Design a protein around this ligand. Structure first.
Ligand SMILES: CCCCCCCCCCCCCCCCCC(=O)OC[C@H](COP(=O)([O-])OCC[N+](C)(C)C)OC(=O)CCCCCCCCCCCCCCCCC
Ligand SMILES: CCCCCCCCCCCCCCCCCC(=O)OC[C@H](COP(=O)([O-])OCC[N+](C)(C)C)OC(=O)CCCCCCCCCCCCCCCCC
Ligand SMILES: CCCCCCCCCCCO[C@@H]1O[C@H](CO)[C@@H](O[C@H]2O[C@H](CO)[C@@H](O)[C@H](O)[C@H]2O)[C@H](O)[C@H]1O
Ligand SMILES: CCCCCCCCCCCO[C@@H]1O[C@H](CO)[C@@H](O[C@H]2O[C@H](CO)[C@@H](O)[C@H](O)[C@H]2O)[C@H](O)[C@H]1O
Ligand SMILES: CCCCCCCCCCCO[C@@H]1O[C@H](CO)[C@@H](O[C@H]2O[C@H](CO)[C@@H](O)[C@H](O)[C@H]2O)[C@H](O)[C@H]1O
Ligand SMILES: CCCCCCCCCCCO[C@@H]1O[C@H](CO)[C@@H](O[C@H]2O[C@H](CO)[C@@H](O)[C@H](O)[C@H]2O)[C@H](O)[C@H]1O
Ligand SMILES: CCCCCCCCCCCO[C@@H]1O[C@H](CO)[C@@H](O[C@H]2O[C@H](CO)[C@@H](O)[C@H](O)[C@H]2O)[C@H](O)[C@H]1O
Ligand SMILES: CCCCCCCCCCCO[C@@H]1O[C@H](CO)[C@@H](O[C@H]2O[C@H](CO)[C@@H](O)[C@H](O)[C@H]2O)[C@H](O)[C@H]1O
Ligand SMILES: CCCCCCCCCCCO[C@@H]1O[C@H](CO)[C@@H](O[C@H]2O[C@H](CO)[C@@H](O)[C@H](O)[C@H]2O)[C@H](O)[C@H]1O
Ligand SMILES: CCCCCCCCCCCO[C@@H]1O[C@H](CO)[C@@H](O[C@H]2O[C@H](CO)[C@@H](O)[C@H](O)[C@H]2O)[C@H](O)[C@H]1O
Ligand SMILES: CCCCCCCCCCCO[C@@H]1O[C@H](CO)[C@@H](O[C@H]2O[C@H](CO)[C@@H](O)[C@H](O)[C@H]2O)[C@H](O)[C@H]1O
Ligand SMILES: CCCCCCCCCCCO[C@@H]1O[C@H](CO)[C@@H](O[C@H]2O[C@H](CO)[C@@H](O)[C@H](O)[C@H]2O)[C@H](O)[C@H]1O
Ligand SMILES: [Ca+2]
Ligand SMILES: [Ca+2]
Ligand SMILES: [Ca+2]
Ligand SMILES: [Ca+2]
Ligand SMILES: [Ca+2]
Ligand SMILES: [Ca+2]
Lengths: 629, 629
């Protein structure tokens, strides 16, 4: 009753006492009795008439030997004394670096909350056919208790607790408000898990990978050096540099994910996602009882409902693009009509209105695609994430770059392309930084001041540092994965690299954004959202394919912008049939050299590959010594 | 002394008696005494004055429990009773299908010879600093005995024995001399290992994958249907069909290699190859003692000696191409000079001479590249094979298709392109089938008749069925891997798919070749060569990338041949700048649709993926039950 709280479970209001005692008896009971062996506590041992509306919050922690056995059960990969990353076991626990028998600093709070979430997830029902007290909670043997408690509306949320004394010491070394500074990815990892640290490492890498593009492209646009090289040197430098940074990110990510251990953590078998419903049956792979869904019904629900909706949304995005171009022609006629002083500022208004309409339509399509992909009854979470990423990537690519493609390849007017690209990039980045972190931080500050003034007017002997913290973090927003935060970088790379020939200055407009975003997203993790659960990840995932596809599409787009400028057309003034052949030959040579650069450089580095080969050879020698005895 | 001989070891002539008794004491001795526990025998217990020149051949076999323990040591994957492919262990040996305690039909002769070769390979020296009787044989602890006996010229060759009563029952169902017949890949596997069976399965697949190309392209060339579709339907059909067959081969190969078990055999750690010499030192990965070579010396020996030699050989191939074109112009002038009757046959002579010079220069470059890649001191065998495949593929692509590229894209004369492509393909295939299998089979028949007539004039009580067989198979040729046999199919796919627009009939010229090659290569494995050692292989390897690169290059080549025909140029007679743009757009759409087809179709099939997921889940449940106890 004096332990450290790690995970808060918030029950619903209308929850009977029998379900509460049954959940408390299924949490505290030992691992041999079908429980989880976690220390359980109410938020307050006593209650008064004021705090009766907060009577459902419960705290879950455990003891040290329980956390070490849970780390054995999860499969954490820690550093041994001989500079080797091996899986953690309780029988071989003395081989690991920084471990004592009396050390509470071995497993960090992020790993402890991950272990408690994994032990609450692996809390299955064996004998019970229903939840005691609730009729409709259909429980089959082999079904997780927490998933059915979350879907049926009994457990509202399970969230870990922020540590207000280790978050401040992270924030002191995170906000690079003064100048350039290397981001502390290891402390970000030790506080937030590995997925958030991999995102912040990718953002720190992508910031320091557009700096050669911005530095080369800043006098290339101001001093106009397009006369001397005629768009051949700079375009080749941009495309080769994009391939080089997208391969060296894979090398640095292999180095980082070996340094944390998640390169060696095995692939855990995935449970059906919360919201996959079928008929009860025998799972073919595992042999246990699971919901089953026929695959032809899922393929019909995709290829007859989702794909026509995606095509309708792409057509509606093109229709809004045509409305914007009619508005642009109307504003140009109004500039031709009225005057000179107020009719130059009037040309920047419809692109700003179009950027706001783009950032509204993207969120509306995001809600529609989340509903339409949660409707197709996807089994795993990886397949649901892949389908959602495909839908959102296709519509966001079309809706963001359709007007720029229509300016560049139909109107062929580079001045309007420069103006529209700069206005779209700057307005979308500013509205992204306002709606993403700053306005939710202001609303969170207002809510925190209100919760503080409510807690200070109390009539009980409450230790305020814990109850006040749990009440404040109950009403915070949850983190919905690192999907929008990679999508913003994908659209930044799209605005930079697709039209870097006709407008390299936009690359600088990414770097001056990222110098804020490294701060801003950090604030979004620190004072805006709840603490996310730690998730091990070995790579960025499917985003590597998306960034490489962007870098491949930008080859064709950059060469088509080379073959339309007045600089290259002065070389071939009369014969426009050899210009297309030379531009297509340069484009195919750049694609071949890009694929040769992506295939030649190895993905893992040299010493990481040697360490994985040593880790394989030690297991092979263990197998040989088991065979020999 | 009455066992079945499986592996023949041929010693050299000048070998002292002490080395023979030391090798015999290191073979027969048990596994705990540092030996191999194999039954060893001389070829003949007695010798007369006639057979004294064949006194170095020795036979190696073993007993049944020894072969089962060696199958446990190797890691064979056999079928359990519950339709599951698990690794073979002697303690769990009763779970497997078709196994008795008194059954000599469980492990086939190919698997037994592979196990005996693996036990002779894993015969290491511990105490001895040199081979007893030979001073220069430098032996370090951790060095294989058979490798040092092979490199120092004491053991001449180690080869398995043909089974003359199971080869006939394979040959009865292999030679499809009558008509079309499905090739027995499982019996080919059970006799020849998995690599030869994967090659013959790929040849059987590639024969039945050019039949739609030949059947569609036979009236497309005779009835000239190029007027109606204008090269758009047929080219798209060819490129989509090449992508579809190169993905369905990966699906069928996953199915076959799961059906044999080599999809689940673990990657064995590779010893340094026979001919990698450096300085003696500590291996960083394994920790034992190995030869070490500095990587910068190897990179210098590649990028300063090998690459200039490859560039010089490509320049010499272009110079021989220019000599052939001067000869072609001279023969055309001679046809203009002399007459009509004998001056039409004279146009086919210089292309035949060029095909013979191509097939001579390819073998000369193959010898030069084998010497130049065995000179760079490559450590593993996979790296040596990859470098040799790169050199031979680049030179053979250039030397075979340089004249056709010069006709198609410089001269732009489709009649000479049809004549030269048909003559090069037919003459190269005929000379390939003559020099590959038929002439070595005739020489082997002559040598076998001579060896038979020598053995029948004997003066001893020799059981002739074994000694005669070992003497005949001593002087046969060895199989140098499945590299030339995939290279022939690569060049066939190059001659078919690069110029399938202007000459689809050549696709038929592949199928009428393969209907012989399925027979001919089979004869090359049956009555020409020694029995190859069984090698497990899960795929064709790097040849998938080579066939996909050929299918990608053929998109650009087919579209460049579309944009030069008189059929497509009649659509755009005046504006030749929109024709190039439309052809390049069709080419990029075909490349995008080809990559979408290669990414959309999964590599492994559905049920193979379910079986691998079940095999992973059973091991995860075993780990969980080990953790719970
Ligand atoms: C202009 C717009 C078009 C170009 C835009 C390009 C933007 C960048 C895209 C980068 C690649 C993203 C890949 C995401 C991914 O993994 O997807 C595969 C995912 C993978 O799903 P999965 O997990 O089932 O597949 C795994 C199997 N492998 C790995 C072999 C593919 O595919 C799907 O989800 C299939 C969905 C089909 C239906 C989609 C309907 C909406 C989209 C319609 C597009 C066409 C009309 C327009
Ligand atoms: C016209 C001629 C050019 C086009 C011909 C195209 C024919 C088809 C080629 C298909 C791809 C074959 C790939 C083989 C392979 O694995 O190679 C990689 C192998 C792999 O070697 P490795 O095993 O060390 O590398 C493994 C690491 N990964 C997988 C990441 C690549 O690369 C090499 O061996 C490098 C050798 C460099 C020096 C070569 C000198 C001779 C060739 C010069 C070519 C350029 C001048 C001409
Ligand atoms: C047009 C010709 C273009 C040629 C381009 C050649 C590029 C060579 C490779 C460039 C990146 O080289 C990479 O640099 C990083 C450090 O930044 C090294 O680490 C890595 O081992 C190396 O592979
Ligand atoms: C151009 C983009 C610029 C982006 C800048 C982003 C960063 C701005 C804010 C930096 C300081 O961040 C600030 O840190 C302090 C702690 O030191 C936080 O304070 C909070 O925690 C402390 C410590 O428990 C409490 O005493 C305090 O009452 C509470 O409000 C505050 O809520 C946060 O706002
Ligand atoms: C992946 C395929 C890549 C292809 C890349 C090239 C594609 C387009 C090539 C042809 C367009 O190239 C060129 O474009 C311009 C418009 O910008 C056309 O017209 C313009 O030419 C110049 C441009 O300063 C002006 O002097 C002229 O008055 C105007 O008509 C021109 O007739 C065409 O020749
Ligand atoms: C892997 C294979 C790689 C290469 C494949 C592609 C090779 C394409 C080679 C094309 C060479 O063919 C080349 O075509 C251009 C038109 O485009 C010709 O150009 C000529 O005709 C065009 C059309 O009437 C005129 O506009 C132009 O002023 C004139 O020079 C040129 O004389 C010829 O030499
Ligand atoms: C057409 C000419 C094309 C030139 C392309 C040049 C590509 C260079 C690729 C080799 C350099 O990449 C190098 O690879 C080795 C492994 O082999 C790495 O080690 C090293 O860190 C990396 O730097
Ligand atoms: C231009 C439009 C072209 C569209 C092409 C569409 C191709 C669809 C796939 C064709 C091959 O389809 C494949 O057929 C084999 C049987 O032969 C099946 O097995 C496999 O599951 C299926 O994937
Ligand atoms: C278009 C291309 C056509 C390719 C045709 C390829 C096949 C042609 C030969 C087919 C028959 O193959 C033939 O089989 C017999 C066995 O039955 C072989 O005979 C050999 O083994 C048998 C059995 O131990 C011995 O009795 C015999 O003395 C020995 O020569 C012979 O060497 C081989 O040549
Ligand atoms: C990846 C890039 C792919 C590009 C594909 C297209 C490349 C070449 C395009 C231009 C060549 O297209 C065309 O070729 C022929 C030669 O075959 C040229 O010349 C010929 O045209 C026709 C061909 O029956 C004849 O009537 C004429 O007398 C002759 O000069 C023509 O001027 C050019 O217009
Ligand atoms: C991801 C991006 C995908 C698309 C990228 C490539 C887009 C290229 C679009 C090019 C359209 O530009 C198009 O160029 C051709 C020349 O090539 C022009 O053609 C015109 O000029 C040329 C040159 O003087 C004349 O030969 C021809 O008879 C005339 O019609 C045409 O009027 C214009 O409309
Ligand atoms: C732009 C239009 C492009 C159309 C491309 C169509 C590609 C179809 C790919 C889907 C068919 O491929 C199918 O994949 C599933 C797994 O997902 C396999 O199961 C099935 O055997 C195979 O047939
Ligand atoms: Ca932002
Ligand atoms: Ca962000
Ligand atoms: Ca790579
Ligand atoms: Ca042949
Ligand atoms: Ca062959
Ligand atoms: Ca695939």
């Amino acid at each position: 009753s004096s332990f450290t709280p790690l995970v808060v479970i918030e029950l619903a209001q209308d929850v009977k006492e029998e379900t509460k005692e049954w959940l408390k008896n299924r949490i505290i009971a030992k691992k041999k009795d079908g429980g989880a062996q976690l220390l359980f506590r109410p938020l307050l041992n006593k209650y008064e008439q004021e705090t009766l509306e907060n009577q459902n919050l419960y705290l879950v922690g455990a003891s040290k030997i329980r956390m070490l056995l849970g780390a054995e059960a999860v499969g954490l990969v820690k550093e041994c004394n001989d500079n080797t990353m091996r899986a953690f076991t309780y029988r071989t626990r003395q081989n690991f670096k920084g471990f004592d028998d009396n050390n509470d600093d071995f497993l960090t709070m992020a790993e402890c909350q991950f272990i408690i979430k994994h032990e609450l997830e692996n809390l299955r029902a064996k004998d019970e056919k229903m939840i005691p007290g609730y009729p409709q909670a259909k429980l089959y043997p082999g079904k997780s208790l927490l998933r059915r408690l979350l879907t049926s509306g009994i457990v509202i949320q399970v969230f870990p607790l922020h540590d207000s004394e280790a978050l401040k010491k992270l924030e002191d070394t995170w906000y690079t408000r003064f100048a350039l500074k290397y981001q502390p990815i290891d402390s970000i990892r030790g506080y937030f898990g590995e997925t958030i640290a991999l995102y912040f490492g990718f953002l720190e890498y992508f910031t320091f990978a557009l700096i050669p593009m911005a530095v080369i492209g800043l006098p290339y646009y101001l001093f106009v050096w397009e006369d001397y090289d005629k768009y051949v040197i700079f375009a080749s430098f941009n495309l080769i540099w994009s391939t080089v940074i997208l391969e060296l990110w894979k090398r640095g990510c292999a180095n980082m994910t070996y340094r944390w251990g998640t390169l060696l953590m095995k692939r855990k078998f995935e449970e059906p996602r919360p919201g996959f419903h079928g008929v009860l049956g025998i799972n073919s792979i595992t042999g246990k009882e699971e919901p089953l869904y026929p695959s032809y019904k899922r393929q019909l629900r995709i290829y007859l409902v989702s794909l026509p909706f995606v095509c309708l949304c792409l057509y509606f995005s093109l229709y809004v693009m045509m409305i914007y171009f009619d508005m642009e022609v109307w504003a140009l006629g109004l500039h031709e009509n009225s005057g000179s002083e107020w009719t130059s500022v009037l040309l920047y208004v419809p692109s700003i209105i179009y950027a706001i309409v783009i950032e509204i339509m993207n969120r509306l399509y995001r809600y529609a695609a989340e509903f339409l992909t949660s409707w197709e009854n996807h089994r795993l979470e990886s397949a649901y994430q892949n389908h959602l990423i495909l839908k959102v990537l296709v519509f966001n690519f079309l809706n963001c770059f359709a007007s720029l493609f229509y300016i560049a390849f139909v109107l062929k007017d580079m001045k309007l392309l420069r103006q529209s690209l700069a206005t779209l990039l700057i307005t979308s980045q500013i509205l992204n930084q306002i709606m993403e972190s700053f306005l939710p931080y202001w609303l969170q500050r207002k809510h925190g001041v209100r919760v503080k003034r409510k807690v200070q007017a109390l009539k009980a002997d409450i230790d305020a540092t814990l109850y006040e913290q749990v009440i404040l973090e109950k009403e915070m927003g949850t983190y919905l994965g690192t999907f929008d935060d990679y999508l913003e970088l994908f659209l930044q790379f799209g605005y930079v690299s697709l039209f870097s020939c006709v407008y390299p200055l936009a690359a600088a407009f990414a770097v001056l954004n990222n110098f804020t975003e490294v701060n801003s997203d950090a604030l979004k993790m620190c004072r805006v959202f709840k603490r996310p659960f730690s998730e091990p990840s070995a790579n960025i995932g499917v985003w590597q394919l998306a960034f490489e596809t962007m870098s491949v599409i930008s080859v064709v787009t950059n060469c088509a912008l080379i073959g339309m400028s007045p600089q290259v057309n002065a070389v071939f003034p009369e014969s426009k049939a050899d210009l297309i052949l030379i531009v297509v030959a340069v484009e195919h040579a750049l694609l071949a050299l890009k694929f040769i650069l992506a295939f030649a450089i190895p993905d893992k580095p040299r010493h990481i590959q040697m360490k994985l080969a040593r880790l394989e050879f030690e297991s092979l020698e263990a197998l040989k010594q088991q065979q020999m005895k």
